[PDB]
A paper describes a structure:
Normally, these elements reside passively integrated in host bacterial chromosomes under the control of a master repressor protein, Stl (SaPI transcription leftward). Instead, SaPI activation depends on the formation of a complex between Stl and specific phage proteins, which act as inducers of the SaPI life cycle. Contrary to the classical phage and SaPI repressors, which are dimers, the SaPI1 repressor StlSaPI1 presents a unique tetrameric conformation never seen before. To derepress SaPI1, the phage-encoded protein [name] binds to and induces a conformational change in the DNA binding domains of StlSaPI1, preventing the binding of the repressor to its cognate StlSaPI1 sites.
Our previous structural analysis suggested the importance of residue L201 for tetramerization since their mutual interaction projecting from the middle of α8 nucleates the hydrophobic core. In support of this, a StlSaPI1 repressor carrying an L201E mutation (StlSaPI1 L201E), which introduces a charged residue into this hydrophobic environment, formed dimers in solution and confirmed the role of this helix in StlSaPI1 tetramerization. Furthermore, we solved the structure of the [name]-StlSaPI1 L201E complex, confirming both the dimerization state of the L201E mutant and its ability to interact with [name], as our previous co-expression and SEC-MALS experiments suggested. The [name]-StlSaPI1 L201E structure was determined at 2.97 Å resolution by molecular replacement using the wt [name]-StlSaPI1 monomer structure that was previously determined as a model. The asymmetric unit of the crystal showed a monomer of StlSaPI1 L201E bound to a molecule of [name]. This complex formed a dimer with the symmetric molecules with identical organisation to that observed for the dimer formed by subunits A and B in the crystal asymmetric unit of the wt [name]-StlSaPI1 complex (RMSD of 1.2 Å for the superimposition of 489 Cα atoms of wt dimer with mutant crystallographic dimer), confirming the A–B subunit organization for the dimeric StlSaPI1. The [name] molecule binds to StlSaPI1 L201E in a disposition identical to that previously observed in the wt [name]-StlSaPI1 complex, indicating that the L201E mutation did not affect StlSaPI1 binding to [name]. However, although the [name] fold in both wt and mutant StlSaPI1 complexes is identical (RMSD of 1.5 Å for superimposition of 42 Cα atoms), the 7 C-terminal residues were not visible in the complex with the StlSaPI1 L201E mutant. Corroborating this, the [name]-StlSaPI1 L201E complex was unstable during the purification process and we observed [name] released from the complex during gel filtration chromatography. In contrast, the plasmid expressing the dimeric StlSaPI1 L201E repressor showed extremely high reporter expression even in the absence of prophage induction, confirming its inability to cause repression.
Residue numbers in the entry:
A (entry chain E), B (entry chain E): 0 to 43
C (entry chain A), D (entry chain A): -1 to 242
Amino acid sequence: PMVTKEFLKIKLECSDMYAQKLIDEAQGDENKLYDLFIQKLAER
Amino acid sequence: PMVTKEFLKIKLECSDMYAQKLIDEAQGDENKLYDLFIQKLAER
Amino acid sequence: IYMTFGEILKKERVSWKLSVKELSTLSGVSQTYISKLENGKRNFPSLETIFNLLIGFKTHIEYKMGSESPFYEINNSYLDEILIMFINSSNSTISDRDPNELITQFNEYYDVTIKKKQNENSKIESDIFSNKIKLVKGTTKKEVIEKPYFDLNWLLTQNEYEVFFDRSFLLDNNFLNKKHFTEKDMYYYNVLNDNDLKTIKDEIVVFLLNKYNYIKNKDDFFNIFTNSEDDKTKRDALYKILYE
Amino acid sequence: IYMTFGEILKKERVSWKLSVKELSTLSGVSQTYISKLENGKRNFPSLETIFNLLIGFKTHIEYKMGSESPFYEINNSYLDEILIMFINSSNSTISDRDPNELITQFNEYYDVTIKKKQNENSKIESDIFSNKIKLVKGTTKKEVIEKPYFDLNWLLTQNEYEVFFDRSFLLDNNFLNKKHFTEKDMYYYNVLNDNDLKTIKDEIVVFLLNKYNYIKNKDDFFNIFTNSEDDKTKRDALYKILYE
């Protein structure tokens, strides 16, 4: 993670704060997150 | 043929005179005509 | 025993399943005047209005039966045999009944008309080309419009406005498990998403391309097709773009 | 060190790749006032215009990220954290900064707004239903129109006007061997025939039907979806039409 989720800000075209509030869901558990991390980010 | 080409007037929805002017093409040679008789009357 | 001009017109108009409105669109002639001519509330009309009505049937017949060679001859010969039938009406005021003078006069009136139409098109070549046109179905009668609403391609490709389907094969959001119902999208559940539109556009782009003939240059192919150049000269030129 | 309200607005507007026009459509606020607020040519705005702008982002975010449950919570929490950021602006005139009073006030302003919108829709339920609507893409902002031009189904099924394609995958008449070129159809060679349209309609009718969910009753399903009945009560009722 670090601050390398500018990737989300650019592809989803969403605000910095919103890109964080995504990370905030299952934060640190990027493993647990991947099921939802790859949902609207998948069929896009 | 006779006067039993009311069939053409109804399916093509064309005037009596025009239905005759079709028959007039290879008239009596309905055999010869069938190649064109079944053209715009086919893919319709 | 001949029929009156009015009787003859109604016979033809009806036998081609055309409404007074439909024929009044195909022809310059008003709905009211057509009607009145068929009743005999108007006398035998001018020769110029007769030519206009035939031009009406001409446009339609070509839509219906086709401009193809086997029918091309049938159509020209037909329209002629009607032009005679009209001027041989019981109430006709035409004793110059030499057909070949009238038939030739009609073909020389048609040609004059084509030129006027093409001149008037040339002025709006922009809106004609970009398909910013509302063209009455069956007819060459058209009305300029602000956007190409009737261009199927444009509707599917534009990003200005949402595209709908009938209020039937909908719930285009398979996600109908969203708690509080998407704000004001309890009205607009008919909206096709960007994905669907491009899949439908590609579908059609394929379908059409394995028939018909893709045109390389649009500006060019159109520009040569619409002008006062000879028919037999430009057919060669069109085939050149379709087959190099 | 906080940023001014204007600086904050521009940061959010831009980060969501929205133009002043785009946001001025999503929100009640004029293009001019938005611009002036971002420069500081207008002072800190009213609380009601702040709520309007958030409603703007609200509509967009739901279009982009979705109204779905996993995002539903993220969206509501986000819009709240922005409403606070605005009233904590360097140039803010709000010292009643108790968030839960403002957050609740905003949700109670939103609800009031929804009711007004639905009342105004109810008046034109006719034109909304029959898809006689021009709905700006992304937005719930709409303009009533004389026919359903943007309804893809209607365009393909109507018999009033000719439908075109781009001046490309054309010569929809494979018969380009017709002697003298089809009168004024050296302009309209883009016109799709009745056969093609029905093949394209059926294609799409299939495509959509092996996804999504066909709706048996249109009048009914729509009428229950649009009203002042409880969300959790009507979701049951919608599922009843989709699964008997």
